[PDB]
């Protein structure tokens with residue numbers, strides 16, 4: 001059978017929050033079967049735990065925030081993307097502050113942490129959520145969709161008209177049958193437009209941002225000295241973001257996500273909309289890994 005997976009060892013890193021600019025200690029730890037991912041604010045007294053599930057998402061302002069009462073864990077999407085991409089079912093994530101460190105702006109640093117810790121197979125069947133019927137949500141011209149698919153695929157289109165984006169692909173459809181999350185998605189950095197970043201900074205936000213952890217573009221140019229890591233890094237980051245949000249479903253997906261100018265708010269609306277309709281999905285396991293349309297080997 002395809003087994004659940006956790007970390008083999010505890011592993012740590014430090015960084016600063018993008019929004020807050022606050023130095024933060026991050027710890028990833030093994031967890032038992034059927035735990036899922038649970039975040040812990042270890043700086044608080046008492047310590048507050050928040051399961052990484054769609055129902056615990058509060059704010060979605062250019063990022064995904066988990067909330068429990070007045071306690072928040074901000075910017076979970078890049079770390080969760082790495083967890084999803086490497087097939088980690090169960091883990092504890094400890095934080096000394098209310099925001100996951102931004103690191104280099106991508107999921108790469110979290111992939112490094114996970115691969116360094118090692119992967120541990122557990123004695124329980126891994127559960128998958130299979131999309132049975134297409135589900136969609138919209139806001140204005142933005143759209144997010146789950147489509148049945150015998151495998152796992154994430155498609156995304158952005159539609160910027162600014163000169164800097166002219167001629168760029170602005171679209172990708174990634175079938176993970178033949179695409180490596182690690183090599184081809186995980187290192188795509190977050191990006192921001194100068195006018196937007198300036199607006200945030202003018203309010204004392206985005207304090208952790210720098211050219212060292214984000215792609216900065218103006219109307220006409222990519223400002224970063226060494227350009228892009230992937231030819232289509234922008235849309236690849238949107239895909240990375242979607243995969244991170246997808247993981248709030250609590251299980252790996254058998255299906256396709258399609259995003260059209262979508263963001264974290266719409267992604268999360270899609271999750272809650274799917275979850276609510278039991279006719280649109282089912283949970284499956286594979287006692288014989290060879291019959292599975294996906295592979296985590």
Ligand SMILES: C[C@@H](O)[C@H](NC(=O)c1ccc(C#CC#Cc2ccccc2)cc1)C(=O)NO
Pocket residue numbers: 062063064077078190191192197200206209210211214216241263
């Ligand atoms: C992509 C979107 O969904 C989103 N990213 C952001 O909203 C975002 C916000 C701020 C910055 C920034 C910055 C900066 C800076 C800087 C540079 C030089 C000197 C001082 C500051 C980058 C991305 C995101 O990726 N969510 O997952």
Ligand SMILES: [Zn+2]
Pocket residue numbers: 161162163219
């Ligand atoms: Zn423009």
Ligand SMILES: [Zn+2]
Pocket residue numbers: 077078190237241
């Ligand atoms: Zn992002």
